[PDB]
Amino acid sequence: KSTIVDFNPVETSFEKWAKPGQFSRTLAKGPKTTTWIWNLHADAHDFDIQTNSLQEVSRKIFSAHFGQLAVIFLWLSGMHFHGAYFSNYSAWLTNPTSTKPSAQIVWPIVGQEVLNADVGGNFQGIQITSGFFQLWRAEGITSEVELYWTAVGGLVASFLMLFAGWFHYHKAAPKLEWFQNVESMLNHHLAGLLGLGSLSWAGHQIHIALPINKLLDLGVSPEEIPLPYEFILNRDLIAQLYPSFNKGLTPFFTLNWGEYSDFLTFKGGLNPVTGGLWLTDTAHHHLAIAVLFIVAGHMYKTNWFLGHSIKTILEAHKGPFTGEGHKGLYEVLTTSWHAQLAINLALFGSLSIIVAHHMYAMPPYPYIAIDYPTQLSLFTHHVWIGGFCIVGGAAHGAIFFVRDYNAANNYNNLIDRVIRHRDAIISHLNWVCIFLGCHSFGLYVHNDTMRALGRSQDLFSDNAIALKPIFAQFIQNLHTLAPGSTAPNALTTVSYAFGGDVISVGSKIAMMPISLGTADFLVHHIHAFTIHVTVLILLKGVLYSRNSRLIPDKANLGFRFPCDGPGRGGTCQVSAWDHVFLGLFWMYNSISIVIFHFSWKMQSDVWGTVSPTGAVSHITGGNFAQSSITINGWLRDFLWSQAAQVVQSYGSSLSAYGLIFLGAHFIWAFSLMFLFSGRGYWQELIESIVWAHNKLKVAPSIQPRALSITQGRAVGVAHYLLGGIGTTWAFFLARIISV
Amino acid sequence: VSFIKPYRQDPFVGHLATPITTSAFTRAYLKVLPAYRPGLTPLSRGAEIGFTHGYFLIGPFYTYGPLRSVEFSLTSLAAGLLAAITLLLILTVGLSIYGQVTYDVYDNALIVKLVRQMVGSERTQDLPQIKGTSELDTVLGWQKFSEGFFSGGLIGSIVAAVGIALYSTYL
Amino acid sequence: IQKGSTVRILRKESYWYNESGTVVVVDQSKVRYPVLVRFTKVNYAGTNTNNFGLNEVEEVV
Amino acid sequence: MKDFLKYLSTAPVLLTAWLTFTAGFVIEINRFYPDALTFPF
Amino acid sequence: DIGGLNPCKDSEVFQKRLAKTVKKLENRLKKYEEGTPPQIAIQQQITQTKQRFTRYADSNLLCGNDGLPHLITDGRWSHGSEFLLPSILFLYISGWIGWVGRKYIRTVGQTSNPTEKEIIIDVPLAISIMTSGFLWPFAAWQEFLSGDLIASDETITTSP
Amino acid sequence: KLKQSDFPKFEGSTGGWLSAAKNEEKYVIIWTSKDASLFEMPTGGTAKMNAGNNVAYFARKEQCLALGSQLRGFKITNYKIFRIYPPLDITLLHPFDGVFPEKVNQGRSPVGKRDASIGGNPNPASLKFQ
Amino acid sequence: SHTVKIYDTCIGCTQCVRACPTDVLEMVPWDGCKAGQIASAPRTEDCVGCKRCETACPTDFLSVRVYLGGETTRSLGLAY
Numbered sequence A: 001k002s003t004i005v006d007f008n009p010v011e012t013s014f015e016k017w018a019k020p021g022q023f024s025r026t027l028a029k030g031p032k033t034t035t036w037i038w039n040l041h042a043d044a045h046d047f048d049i050q051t052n053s054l055q056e057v058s059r060k061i062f063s064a065h066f067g068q069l070a071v072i073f074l075w076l077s078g079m080h081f082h083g084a085y086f087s088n089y090s091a092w093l094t095n096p097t098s099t100k101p102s103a104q105i106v107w108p109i110v111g112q113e114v115l116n117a118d119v120g121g122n123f124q125g126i127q128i129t130s131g132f133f134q135l136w137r138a139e140g141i142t143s144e145v146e147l148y149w150t151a152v153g154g155l156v157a158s159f160l161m162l163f164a165g166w167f168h169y170h171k172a173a174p175k176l177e178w179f180q181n182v183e184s185m186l187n188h189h190l191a192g193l194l195g196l197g198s199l200s201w202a203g204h205q206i207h208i209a210l211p212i213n214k215l216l217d218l219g220v221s222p223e224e225i226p227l228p229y230e231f232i233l234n235r236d237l238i239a240q241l242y243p244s245f246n247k248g249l250t251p252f253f254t255l256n257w258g259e260y261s262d263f264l265t266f267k268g269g270l271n272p273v274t275g276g277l278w279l280t281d282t283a284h285h286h287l288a289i290a291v292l293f294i295v296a297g298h299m300y301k302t303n304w305f306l307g308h309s310i311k312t313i314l315e316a317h318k319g320p321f322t323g324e325g326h327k328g329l330y331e332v333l334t335t336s337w338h339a340q341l342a343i344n345l346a347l348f349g350s351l352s353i354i355v356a357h358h359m360y361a362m363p364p365y366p367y368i369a370i371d372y373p374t375q376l377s378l379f380t381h382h383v384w385i386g387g388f389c390i391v392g393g394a395a396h397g398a399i400f401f402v403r404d405y406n407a408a409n410n411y412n413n414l415i416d417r418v419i420r421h422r423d424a425i426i427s428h429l430n431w432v433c434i435f436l437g438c439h440s441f442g443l444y445v446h447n448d449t450m451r452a453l454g455r456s457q458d459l460f461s462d463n464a465i466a467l468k469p470i471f472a473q474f475i476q477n478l479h480t481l482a483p484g485s486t487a488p489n490a491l492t493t494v495s496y497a498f499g500g501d502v503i504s505v506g507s508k509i510a511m512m513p514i515s516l517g518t519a520d521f522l523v524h525h526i527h528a529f530t531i532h533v534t535v536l537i538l539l540k541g542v543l544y545s546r547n548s549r550l551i552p553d554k555a556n557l558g559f560r561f562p563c564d565g566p567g568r569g570g571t572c573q574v575s576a577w578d579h580v581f582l583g584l585f586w587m588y589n590s591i592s593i594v595i596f597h598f599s600w601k602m603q604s605d606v607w608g609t610v611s612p613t614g615a616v617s618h619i620t621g622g623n624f625a626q627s628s629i630t631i632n633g634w635l636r637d638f639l640w641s642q643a644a645q646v647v648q649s650y651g652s653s654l655s656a657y658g659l660i661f662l663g664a665h666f667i668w669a670f671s672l673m674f675l676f677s678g679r680g681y682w683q684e685l686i687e688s689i690v691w692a693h694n695k696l697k698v699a700p701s702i703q704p705r706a707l708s709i710t711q712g713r714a715v716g717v718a719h720y721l722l723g724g725i726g727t728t729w730a731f732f733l734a735r736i737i738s739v
Numbered sequence B: 001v002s003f004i005k006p007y008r009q010d011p012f013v014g015h016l017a018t019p020i021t022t023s024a025f026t027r028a029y030l031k032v033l034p035a036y037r038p039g040l041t042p043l044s045r046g047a048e049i050g051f052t053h054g055y056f057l058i059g060p061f062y063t064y065g066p067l068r069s070v071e072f073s074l075t076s077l078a079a080g081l082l083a084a085i086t087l088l089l090i091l092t093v094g095l096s097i098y099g100q101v102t103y104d105v106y107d108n109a110l111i112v113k114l115v116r117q118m119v120g121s122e123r124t125q126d127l128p129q130i131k132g133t134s135e136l137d138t139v140l141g142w143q144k145f146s147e148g149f150f151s152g153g154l155i156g157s158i159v160a161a162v163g164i165a166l167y168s169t170y171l
Numbered sequence C: 001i002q003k004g005s006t007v008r009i010l011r012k013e014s015y016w017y018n019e020s021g022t023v024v025v026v027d028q029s030k031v032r033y034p035v036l037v038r039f040t041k042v043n044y045a046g047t048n049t050n051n052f053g054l055n056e057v058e059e060v061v
Numbered sequence D: 001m002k003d004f005l006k007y008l009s010t011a012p013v014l015l016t017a018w019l020t021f022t023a024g025f026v027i028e029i030n031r032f033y034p035d036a037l038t039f040p041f
Numbered sequence E: 001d002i003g004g005l006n007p008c009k010d011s012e013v014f015q016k017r018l019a020k021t022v023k024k025l026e027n028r029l030k031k032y033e034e035g036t037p038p039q040i041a042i043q044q045q046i047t048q049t050k051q052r053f054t055r056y057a058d059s060n061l062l063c064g065n066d067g068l069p070h071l072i073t074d075g076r077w078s079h080g081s082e083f084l085l086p087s088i089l090f091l092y093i094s095g096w097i098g099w100v101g102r103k104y105i106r107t108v109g110q111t112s113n114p115t116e117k118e119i120i121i122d123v124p125l126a127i128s129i130m131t132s133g134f135l136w137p138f139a140a141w142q143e144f145l146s147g148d149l150i151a152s153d154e155t156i157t158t159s160p
Numbered sequence F: 001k002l003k004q005s006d007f008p009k010f011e012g013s014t015g016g017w018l019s020a021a022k023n024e025e026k027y028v029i030i031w032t033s034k035d036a037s038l039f040e041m042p043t044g045g046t047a048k049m050n051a052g053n054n055v056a057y058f059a060r061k062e063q064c065l066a067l068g069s070q071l072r073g074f075k076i077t078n079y080k081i082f083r084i085y086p087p088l089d090i091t092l093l094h095p096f097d098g099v100f101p102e103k104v105n106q107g108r109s110p111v112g113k114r115d116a117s118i119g120g121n122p123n124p125a126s127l128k129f130q
Numbered sequence G: 001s002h003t004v005k006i007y008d009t010c011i012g013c014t015q016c017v018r019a020c021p022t023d024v025l026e027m028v029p030w031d032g033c034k035a036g037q038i039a040s041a042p043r044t045e046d047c048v049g050c051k052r053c054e055t056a057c058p059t060d061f062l063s064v065r066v067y068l069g070g071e072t073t074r075s076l077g078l079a080y
């Protein structure tokens, strides 16, 4: 009878596994039409409509989190197992600059063995662009046995998380008060999870990754490198590489932290041997992060007369312009899972995009900057994940507004005041979007039409009307001057992208000053415009989710509904879901432009080879500066030019990329059937098909119905995203692996 | 204190009394503008608006036109001046047609009172209704407004061309 | 026709036209559509029953 | 094991098992007799 | 011969294709070492390529001017193994599938809960029906004769 | 603070009526409440009722009716909606005969009733050029 | 304004009237059904065409039918 958990709440039985739709009150009666099948999967994780108790929803969410973490652990275990058994990691360790990482071999069936490429190191397989080899090298993993043991540990951890989910749904489910301890949860997630994870990783780096990687960079082969445990039992194997361990932990406890400058450095730049960040800098960074997060975890009052109450902090932040201020926000975020999901997903996607930027900007792994496929894939993948997560955060903000928003509890607070002037916000955001689009894109079109008319001096180019990004160049200058002036204890700039020397590893450029000209001005304003339009769609969905001048009772129709009818001139897509659908489209557009800008700019003005005398030759040859300012330039010098490797991949080991290119084109075009058409035509065609089936006595008892309007839109957008992202995926991968 | 309140004590208007809509600075600044400055005939309002608009309109045409010159060129100035004048002509055409299709009144601030007093049992929209009581809201008022806009636009464009030539020559 | 009888729907604007249903109750009052018929197949609106007139239903042998 | 066998009798599990078996025997026919453009007879 | 094509056994371009593929595979084989699994895999690829080309040559297959086997599907039994025999095989298999599906639909359509037995298959009855589809050509031309294959006027029709 | 004492304690929203409900028509909903309950405006956000007479103005009949439907959740039933033309031309709209349209009241005649089902509609080809 | 017609298949279940967002439909006495009531459309000038009325109709092919016609500021749902 614990005060935090309920014991044996749900019986572990297979009876409900044999009753599909048991969770829903409407679906439990059984299918009558094929719409029931689709409704079954669309409501599976909508725990809000399955129970009327916040406690049950919270417990379901907790167990679902455990299942998700078990799935993630299984995926990581699979990655490590493939590295251990079906990879050339050992060969890549001895030749990182000449062996391509491969960790998946393809069975010899139907002639598909051509996919096993010549990745080097007496190996055949698919080249890997996830950068696991570089990460494992940075971890100090020098043998495939360690990868096997990490895979075994991942399997054990996945089973543990599965057992934890089962235990906390069926044997000991926490109570609502336990879930609502946001102060305790924040304290623990900030100190324990974040800070202690940073501290543990700093310890691992210092004791395992720092010596092993230093020996690897010195040229010591992985076979004669001591086993990682020997660096702990023997204080002399690590004190030779870093002659500060001879003093032990006495400098730490005597506040003489200057003695540890051997392995806790602040250098900046990149390791000249590997092209990645100095691992001493990384260990010092993780140590500082650990201390900062542990300190930050002692902020909120949990169980003693010590710390802050988030309710008292929020309620004190009022103002003349904001009425009641943040009063009621604590109740909103402690009684609505959707609001928490909105905030967490938005910040999580933004964090993913920031991670993507800082990855290529400052390569943190050895021999990852010179693996161009890995860098391109990591950036594009993380930016895509960030965009999807941001759209999801907007969607769940809209869901909270529709479902969990209480008008009485939010009288004259920030949420109320935002809804009260939603018109002004949306109208000014509309004006900003029109201004930004007009300018950015019409400058592009003006360049295109001036070039087409033979007026080269009338373009918005560097040798013409020039739009120099002076503000960004000022920041670039400030960073390259930071070491010794504003960061006096730095030896080198944080990233060579801001300026400095060309860093090359094995005649391949790792990082180099990224010059910003009029071409970068236009593409940056294109980014701003696309982001603003996506924000416009999502914010219009969130703010007008409850009511509008069209439908004053839109909240009574729910978050997900197709329309209110053909009246009022037509009330299609007025939902808030139909705004997360359009916003998904515009996020695809924005992220596609972002990754295109990254790919072309890097290939044209960063990546390449360096001659022995210091001459820099890039992959494309600097065509970004003069040919990325017109739409015809993007079509020809980027799309047409770099699509050559994809279309000429047939018969080679990259033929799978051409096949996926074609299939993604097919899927993207397939999406337009659902996006352009309507439900009535398909229902009436199914009518004649059903007539034929009845004529042959083969009409199913479950009456076949065309997909609902909302499901038609969902299928269309899912296929559109899959096709477009897969086309860009195949194009990028084939292009950057070939060259 | 609260700096946002319902506009004119009406919580049902689609408007708010923010520190921008109803600030003393906003009041004075909009009351010194030609469109709202007291004591101006519609012709005077149009003339001032046209002068300012032609004056700042000749700029972009002369600077970024198809016949630019990093040095001073009489042809560039003439091209910019002609483009500005033709744009003012297009704007005046728009003003004329807008006034033609919008109003049917020759003397406002009275007809409203006449139909609020002596009844308006007619086809309405001319006797009754009547949006706005300004002198700009009449057929005669808008015609003189357009005439003033057009004349002032020509004069201001010429003045700005002269100023541009003087600045480029003597500086 | 009576309760439990099987009838064929003769109403053309019906989701169960030419199909067979089960009569739930035939009203004896002066209503316009007294026959209430229950069907196994739900219509497009989800309902599985409807009121029919005496001349819009034909009893199956 | 009365409701577990009923769960295995559901449409998704049965379709997954049948399609896995189908792809399996197709792939194995194509392994043991590869590159079959015409009928073997 | 038929349509201006020639047998692949006497098509020079066919042998050129075989030689080029084998040469590419051997050149790939040259860059690996000893009896290592990559060399074994490439050698198996070469052997399979040679076997496939030899089988296509000795298969009554007509090759065009590009040295690729062309299919003669006009209906002649001479090239009957290209389309006609696979056509019969597919017709048998697909008729089996359709027959067992229709039989299952009609069988569980006369139970208390026909819709339940469509998402939760009666595996015993399903297995009973599925292995009975080998007589689908005979069952179809024994149910059509009895009038049990086609509905007549209980089928629904739209308003016009 | 507000023009009239019976207005709900609303802080004003940029979602209220516009120039249309000054020269074409405006709609007013009146009701009496026992408690100063906090309710959501059909246009903007949260407003506070008056413990007594309450009067609200809107630009559409649908907005007033949505507010009235919300009022039913507060056990408020006596709400009445009027249409006001550009001058003070008040016309009672929603409780037209004092009884809600969902409840049958004597004195109502059927409007738009056809003495046949859908299938009895005439063929469009016979309704050409009339 | 749109056109709304009521047909004698009406069973007087009132679901159309209580679904109208603009108070177009009302229940009037009748003698053609058990409930003794039939829907009426006396205020079609307020009809917006949202067709919520016939989404709540349980009769087989509807007893209330909305035919979209000429548009008006009321029928277009214009708050401006």
Ligand code: CLA
Pocket (backbone or CB within 6 Å): A061, A062, A065, A066, A069, A178, A179, A181, A182, A184, A185, A188, A189, A191, A192, A193
């Ligand atoms: C220092 C203590 C501590 C630590 C380390 C964590 C760590 C975590 N919590 Mg958690 N939590 C804590 C205290 C702590 N919590 C307290 C005190 C409360 C009560 C307010 C909660 C309430 C809570 C909820 C409601 C949820 C989490 C979730 C999570 C996970 C977030 C997912 C993630 O980042 O993946 C990082 C993943 C890893 C690093 C994998 C290794 C982590 C393992 C499992 C260690 C977990 C520590 C655990 C608390 C020890 C208990 C053991 C048990 C025998 C008592 C993460 C594993 C979320 C989640 O995913 O649910 C499962 C979630 O929904 N926590």
Ligand code: CLA
Pocket (backbone or CB within 6 Å): A041, A042, A043, A044, A045, A046, A047, A345, A388, A389, A390, A391, A392, A393, A395, A399, A559, A560, A577, A580, A581, A584, A718, A722
């Ligand atoms: C932490 C992440 C997270 C979480 C927990 C949720 C959770 C939820 N979301 Mg949500 N969402 C997210 C991210 C997340 N979402 C993101 C990133 C987006 C933007 C795209 C959305 C957009 C979104 C919408 C628009 C809606 C939800 C809804 C829901 C709720 C019901 C979900 C459900 O039943 O789906 C069950 C799961 C499925 C139906 C799976 C569908 C399969 C997907 C679409 C295709 C995946 C393809 C995959 C990549 C493989 C393709 C490869 C190909 C070759 C085969 C639930 C509370 C719905 C709701 O009603 O909320 C109350 C709703 O309407 N969400």
Ligand code: CLA
Pocket (backbone or CB within 6 Å): A429, A430, A431, A433, A434, A435, A436, A437, A438, A441, A442, A445, A533, A536, A537, A582, A583, A585, A586
């Ligand atoms: C190439 C196709 C295309 C184009 C041009 C646009 C353009 C636009 N969309 Mg988009 N959209 C598209 C495809 C496209 N969309 C698709 C496929 C979808 C489906 C998901 C959407 C969904 C969508 C939504 C949901 C939203 C937009 C919005 C916008 C507008 C953003 C504001 C802006 O930049 O206006 C400026 C106009 C342009 C940049 C277009 C070119 C104008 C030129 C360059 C300058 C002016 C030329 C000049 C006037 C020509 C005069 C001569 C002529 C008379 C002969 C803009 C009009 C948002 C909106 O309403 O605006 C805020 C919005 O909310 N779109």
Ligand code: CLA
Pocket (backbone or CB within 6 Å): A688, A689, A690, A692, A693, A696, A698, E097, E098, E099, E100, E101, E102, E104, E121, E126, E129, E130
């Ligand atoms: C298995 C039973 C079955 C049978 C006997 C038929 C028979 C027929 N269908 Mg059909 N159909 C079925 C299932 C079936 N269908 C399913 C499951 C779907 C949904 C995808 C469709 C969708 C469909 C369409 C859209 C059309 C037909 C058409 C037709 C007719 C012409 C043949 C054709 O085009 O094939 C069409 C076959 C497919 C599109 C693929 C069917 C998918 C699989 C192979 C069938 C399902 C197998 C099932 C799971 C087996 C379970 C039984 C087991 C438990 C015992 C013919 C009356 C056409 C027509 O009206 O022409 C007169 C037409 O336009 N059908």
Ligand SMILES: CC1=C(C/C=C(\C)CCC[C@H](C)CCC[C@H](C)CCCC(C)C)C(=O)c2ccccc2C1=O
Pocket (backbone or CB within 6 Å): A673, A674, A675, A677, A678, A679, A682, A705, A706, A707, A708, A709, A711, A712, A713
């Ligand atoms: C085709 C179409 C239909 C009909 C589509 C239907 C009935 C979907 C049928 C799906 C089948 C029955 C199952 C899926 C079969 C696929 C082969 C499985 C997916 C492939 C896997 C690899 C995922 C609609 O209902 C619709 C509704 C609204 C707008 C547009 C449309 C629309 O375009």
Ligand code: SF4
Pocket (backbone or CB within 6 Å): A562, A563, A564, A565, A566, A570, A571, A572, A573, A678, A709
């Ligand atoms: S069906 Fe399509 S069009 Fe007709 S109302 Fe619903 S959404 Fe608008």
Ligand code: SF4
Pocket (backbone or CB within 6 Å): A567, G004, G019, G020, G021, G022, G023, G024, G025, G046, G047, G048, G049, G050, G051, G052, G053, G054, G066
């Ligand atoms: S459309 Fe249907 S619902 Fe909307 S008002 Fe007219 S009748 Fe009532």
Ligand code: SF4
Pocket (backbone or CB within 6 Å): G009, G010, G011, G012, G013, G014, G015, G016, G017, G038, G039, G053, G054, G056, G057, G058, G059, G062, G063, G064
């Ligand atoms: S909808 Fe049809 S049934 Fe429901 S009330 Fe109006 S008329 Fe009677």
